[PDB]
Amino acid sequence: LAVPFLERPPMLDGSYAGDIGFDPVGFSNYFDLRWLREAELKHGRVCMLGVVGFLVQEFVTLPMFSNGVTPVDDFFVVPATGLWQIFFTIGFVEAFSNGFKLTPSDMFADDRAPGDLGFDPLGCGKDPAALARRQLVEVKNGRLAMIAFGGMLHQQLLTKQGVIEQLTNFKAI
Amino acid sequence: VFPGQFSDSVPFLKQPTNLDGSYVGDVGFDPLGFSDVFDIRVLREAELKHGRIAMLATLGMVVQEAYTFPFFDKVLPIPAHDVIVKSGGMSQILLWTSFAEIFGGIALFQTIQGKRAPGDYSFDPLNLSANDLEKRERYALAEIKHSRLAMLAFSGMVHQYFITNQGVIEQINNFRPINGFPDATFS
């Protein structure tokens, strides 16, 4: 149990990966646990790719664009047009992968697994025990990566330095 | 002097209605009857929270005058409050303690339901009194006595600084009476 001085939340049986009974504020109750699980997986995956993007944008820059001082400022130096192309592409992906159901009501109509968008092109998730281990690994890595992204974005905003550049040139504020 | 049942601490006041003696540190001292108006569990949790904060406060009020970190600056703690307010670190102390008290409030609301002991956050990483039960109540009595002593001590140190304008270590080595009373006339 993650919080020993509080009770185990009533809706956290332990079926999902990474469930250690950590919900003191009780979002498991009064909401849909599948919705929260898919939201957690989506945030984890987005930040998980975002950390790698912040690492790559320091040393690797696409020849079409001009690199900024920080990967945070790389959002501004690229033109406004093309940014909305990314916005609309993500909208199309989130519409087609979710089956054009986009609300807490109509989603999970077929009761699919939360976070299972049917995207396994390499076929890694075949063995169910390995599937559960990879579920746990993915969820814990997302829980680490969201905190990491929230840290590194603010570090790049405050110090105006890259993350590796900041780690090699550590200084007080 | 007259026959009758009274409290163990105060002999002219009766034992309070809700102070049965199960809780540690209970010598029957509740003259105004705070336990009659509010629950004893919430009061015990508030007492333990105040006492632990006061323990750390007395330790800080000693150490900060005894030894200041290489960062920040050499300054007395009472104006160091303002210094760290202007520096921004005290707002972060506030944020992190608020984040802890968010779960503390849920613990308190489960204490009213009677699911956890008041002030029992189950925090014993060194298992100093976890496996043994006889040591647990002795350490609880010691903790509550140190809590009350620390509240009194921090109040004393702060109000000594407020009129003396000297450090606690400074005052026990350079003890001067207040207001120039050694050679004061018509005071």
Ligand SMILES: CC1=CCCC(C)(C)[C@H]1/C=C/C(C)=C/C=C/C(C)=C/C=C/C=C(C)/C=C/C=C(C)/C=C/C1=C(C)CCCC1(C)C
């Ligand atoms: C619960 C827990 C587990 C065990 C450890 C511990 C005891 C510490 C305890 C505490 C955990 C804590 C404190 C977690 C903290 C999480 C936090 C603060 C997460 C915050 C993340 C912030 C984020 C993403 C910000 C994202 C901003 C983004 C994208 C975009 C920025 C911008 C760009 C460049 C485009 C234009 C718009 C804008 C805004 C300028």
